[PDB]
Design an enzyme around this catalytic site. Sequence first.
Site, PDB file in Angstrom:
ATOM      1  N   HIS A 119       0.814  -1.181   0.000  1.00 10.68           N
ATOM      2  CA  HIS A 119       0.000   0.000   0.000  1.00 10.68           C
ATOM      3  C   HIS A 119       0.864   1.255   0.000  1.00 10.68           C
ATOM      4  O   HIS A 119       0.615   2.182  -0.767  1.00 10.68           O
ATOM      5  CB  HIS A 119      -0.867  -0.011   1.225  1.00 10.68           C
ATOM      6  CG  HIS A 119      -1.821   1.117   1.285  1.00 10.68           C
ATOM      7  ND1 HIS A 119      -3.057   1.070   0.686  1.00 10.68           N
ATOM      8  CD2 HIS A 119      -1.728   2.328   1.876  1.00 10.68           C
ATOM      9  CE1 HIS A 119      -3.693   2.203   0.912  1.00 10.68           C
ATOM     10  NE2 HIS A 119      -2.909   2.982   1.632  1.00 10.68           N
ATOM     11  N   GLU A 120       1.882   1.293   0.858  1.00 12.87           N
ATOM     12  CA  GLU A 120       2.769   2.451   0.922  1.00 12.87           C
ATOM     13  C   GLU A 120       3.608   2.598  -0.335  1.00 12.87           C
ATOM     14  O   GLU A 120       3.842   3.707  -0.806  1.00 12.87           O
ATOM     15  CB  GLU A 120       3.660   2.364   2.157  1.00 12.87           C
ATOM     16  CG  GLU A 120       2.861   2.392   3.428  1.00 12.87           C
ATOM     17  CD  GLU A 120       2.002   3.647   3.539  1.00 12.87           C
ATOM     18  OE1 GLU A 120       0.931   3.582   4.182  1.00 12.87           O
ATOM     19  OE2 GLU A 120       2.400   4.697   2.989  1.00 12.87           O
ATOM     20  N   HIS A 123       1.724   4.480  -2.831  1.00 12.37           N
ATOM     21  CA  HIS A 123       1.776   5.930  -2.697  1.00 12.37           C
ATOM     22  C   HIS A 123       3.052   6.451  -3.309  1.00 12.37           C
ATOM     23  O   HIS A 123       3.033   7.359  -4.138  1.00 12.37           O
ATOM     24  CB  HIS A 123       1.768   6.361  -1.240  1.00 12.37           C
ATOM     25  CG  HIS A 123       0.425   6.290  -0.603  1.00 12.37           C
ATOM     26  ND1 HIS A 123      -0.636   7.053  -1.033  1.00 12.37           N
ATOM     27  CD2 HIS A 123      -0.032   5.563   0.440  1.00 12.37           C
ATOM     28  CE1 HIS A 123      -1.689   6.802  -0.280  1.00 12.37           C
ATOM     29  NE2 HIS A 123      -1.346   5.903   0.621  1.00 12.37           N
ATOM     30  N   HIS A 129      -5.935   7.112  -3.018  1.00 11.69           N
ATOM     31  CA  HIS A 129      -6.962   6.168  -2.625  1.00 11.69           C
ATOM     32  C   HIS A 129      -8.025   5.938  -3.664  1.00 11.69           C
ATOM     33  O   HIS A 129      -8.123   6.676  -4.642  1.00 11.69           O
ATOM     34  CB  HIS A 129      -7.597   6.606  -1.311  1.00 11.69           C
ATOM     35  CG  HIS A 129      -6.662   6.485  -0.146  1.00 11.69           C
ATOM     36  ND1 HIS A 129      -6.835   7.174   1.038  1.00 11.69           N
ATOM     37  CD2 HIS A 129      -5.511   5.787  -0.010  1.00 11.69           C
ATOM     38  CE1 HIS A 129      -5.831   6.912   1.848  1.00 11.69           C
ATOM     39  NE2 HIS A 129      -5.017   6.076   1.235  1.00 11.69           N
TER      40      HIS A 129
HETATM   41  N1  LIG Z   1      -5.895   0.986  10.071  1.00  8.51           N
HETATM   42  C1  LIG Z   1      -6.256   1.527   8.872  1.00  8.51           C
HETATM   43  O1  LIG Z   1      -6.833   1.011   7.927  1.00  8.51           O
HETATM   44  C2  LIG Z   1      -6.054   3.093   8.761  1.00  8.51           C
HETATM   45  C3  LIG Z   1      -7.242   4.061   8.730  1.00  8.51           C
HETATM   46  C4  LIG Z   1      -7.972   3.983  10.032  1.00  8.51           C
HETATM   47  C5  LIG Z   1      -9.014   3.058  10.410  1.00  8.51           C
HETATM   48  N2  LIG Z   1      -9.392   3.294  11.722  1.00  8.51           N
HETATM   49  C6  LIG Z   1      -8.667   4.364  12.209  1.00  8.51           C
HETATM   50  C7  LIG Z   1      -8.751   4.988  13.543  1.00  8.51           C
HETATM   51  C8  LIG Z   1      -7.852   6.179  13.777  1.00  8.51           C
HETATM   52  C9  LIG Z   1      -6.864   6.669  12.659  1.00  8.51           C
HETATM   53  C10 LIG Z   1      -6.782   5.981  11.323  1.00  8.51           C
HETATM   54  C11 LIG Z   1      -7.698   4.833  11.083  1.00  8.51           C
HETATM   55  N3  LIG Z   1      -5.194   3.357   7.602  1.00  8.51           N
HETATM   56  C12 LIG Z   1      -3.855   3.455   7.586  1.00  8.51           C
HETATM   57  O2  LIG Z   1      -3.287   3.375   8.595  1.00  8.51           O
HETATM   58  C13 LIG Z   1      -3.096   3.784   6.254  1.00  8.51           C
HETATM   59  C14 LIG Z   1      -1.944   2.894   5.869  1.00  8.51           C
HETATM   60  C15 LIG Z   1      -2.403   1.562   5.381  1.00  8.51           C
HETATM   61  C16 LIG Z   1      -3.647   1.137   4.521  1.00  8.51           C
HETATM   62  C17 LIG Z   1      -3.753  -0.238   4.065  1.00  8.51           C
HETATM   63  C18 LIG Z   1      -2.883  -1.475   4.311  1.00  8.51           C
HETATM   64  C19 LIG Z   1      -3.225  -2.656   3.483  1.00  8.51           C
HETATM   65  C20 LIG Z   1      -4.341  -2.689   2.573  1.00  8.51           C
HETATM   66  C21 LIG Z   1      -5.200  -1.514   2.482  1.00  8.51           C
HETATM   67  C22 LIG Z   1      -4.942  -0.279   3.246  1.00  8.51           C
HETATM   68  C23 LIG Z   1      -2.400   5.157   6.393  1.00  8.51           C
HETATM   69  P1  LIG Z   1      -1.957   6.021   4.925  1.00  8.51           P
HETATM   70  O3  LIG Z   1      -3.068   5.897   4.248  1.00  8.51           O
HETATM   71  O4  LIG Z   1      -0.947   5.625   4.152  1.00  8.51           O
HETATM   72  C24 LIG Z   1      -1.632   7.771   5.251  1.00  8.51           C
HETATM   73  C25 LIG Z   1      -1.609   8.667   3.993  1.00  8.51           C
HETATM   74  C26 LIG Z   1      -0.865   9.891   4.136  1.00  8.51           C
HETATM   75  C27 LIG Z   1       0.558   9.906   3.671  1.00  8.51           C
HETATM   76  C28 LIG Z   1       1.353  11.162   3.866  1.00  8.51           C
HETATM   77  C29 LIG Z   1       0.701  12.375   4.528  1.00  8.51           C
HETATM   78  C30 LIG Z   1      -0.705  12.393   4.994  1.00  8.51           C
HETATM   79  C31 LIG Z   1      -1.464  11.167   4.783  1.00  8.51           C
HETATM   80  N4  LIG Z   1      -2.762   8.241   6.037  1.00  8.51           N
HETATM   81  C32 LIG Z   1      -3.117   9.177   7.063  1.00  8.51           C
HETATM   82  O5  LIG Z   1      -4.451   9.452   7.233  1.00  8.51           O
HETATM   83  O6  LIG Z   1      -1.943   9.899   7.638  1.00  8.51           O
HETATM   84  C33 LIG Z   1      -2.201  11.122   8.593  1.00  8.51           C
HETATM   85  C34 LIG Z   1      -3.482  12.045   8.339  1.00  8.51           C
HETATM   86  C35 LIG Z   1      -4.767  11.791   9.209  1.00  8.51           C
HETATM   87  C36 LIG Z   1      -6.191  12.439   8.919  1.00  8.51           C
HETATM   88  C37 LIG Z   1      -6.264  13.307   7.626  1.00  8.51           C
HETATM   89  C38 LIG Z   1      -5.000  13.603   6.755  1.00  8.51           C
HETATM   90  C39 LIG Z   1      -3.616  13.008   7.136  1.00  8.51           C
HETATM   91 ZN   LIG Z   2      -3.026   5.247   1.961  1.00 12.45          ZN
END
Ligand SMILES: NC(=O)[C@H](Cc1c[nH]c2ccccc12)NC(=O)[C@H](CCCc1ccccc1)CP(=O)(O)[C@@H](Cc1ccccc1)NC(=O)OCc1ccccc1
Ligand SMILES: [Zn+2]
Length: 162
Positions: A119-120, A123, A129
């Site tokens: 997933h990362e 990105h 997404h």
């Molecule tokens: N466990 C999850 O699903 C979570 C989302 C989630 C569900 N319940 C929660 C309760 C509290 C907070 C978050 C969550 N996703 C993630 O952690 C994501 C990475 C893994 C997903 C993945 C793995 C395998 C298959 C499918 C999906 C995090 P991210 O999406 O990569 C990251 C994106 C990002 C990168 C750089 C900069 C900003 C944002 N997000 C994230 O939301 O980061 C901080 C943020 C928080 C709120 C709004 C904007 C930014």
């Molecule tokens: Zn993501």
Amino acid sequence: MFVLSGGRWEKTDLTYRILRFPWQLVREQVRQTVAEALQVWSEVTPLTFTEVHEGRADIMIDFARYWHGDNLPFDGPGGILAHAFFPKTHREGDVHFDYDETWTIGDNQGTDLLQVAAHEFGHVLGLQHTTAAKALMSPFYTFRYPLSLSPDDRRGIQHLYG
Ligand SMILES: NC(=O)[C@H](Cc1c[nH]c2ccccc12)NC(=O)[C@H](CCCc1ccccc1)CP(=O)(O)[C@@H](Cc1ccccc1)NC(=O)OCc1ccccc1
Ligand SMILES: [Zn+2]
Ligand SMILES: [Ca+2]
Ligand SMILES: [Zn+2]
């Protein structure tokens, strides 16, 4: 290969480095997993990935907790599992996994490293997404095996790359 991109001839062979490892997994397994998650993308793009053990690479991978100096503090077990961002002061793709998760591989109980990593890397390569639930790029994690690109994922790649 050299691939024309953004008006410029860029290189497709890239490097990545694993800075620190999760404590629940043995290194060799984390190494094979990271490679295997990168390979799901290299199979549908002109890119190749090489592991380096020193210096700065195109993709820098780290396992950190909370505040680790990037303004994206992790939140302990659960919540965010990882994130990837492009630092302004370095020509690289940074990917950080939350060290506080119970990292596992192939076990529907823990948090799957193969999936979060794929997933990362998605990105890092430019994808955003999608609303498709069983997509590698869905915002939410659910244990899903085998690791495979869903149609929405292949379309996404085909949209950003040829
Ligand atoms: N466990 C999850 O699903 C979570 C989302 C989630 C569900 N319940 C929660 C309760 C509290 C907070 C978050 C969550 N996703 C993630 O952690 C994501 C990475 C893994 C997903 C993945 C793995 C395998 C298959 C499918 C999906 C995090 P991210 O999406 O990569 C990251 C994106 C990002 C990168 C750089 C900069 C900003 C944002 N997000 C994230 O939301 O980061 C901080 C943020 C928080 C709120 C709004 C904007 C930014
Ligand atoms: Zn993501
Ligand atoms: Ca967390
Ligand atoms: Zn970080």
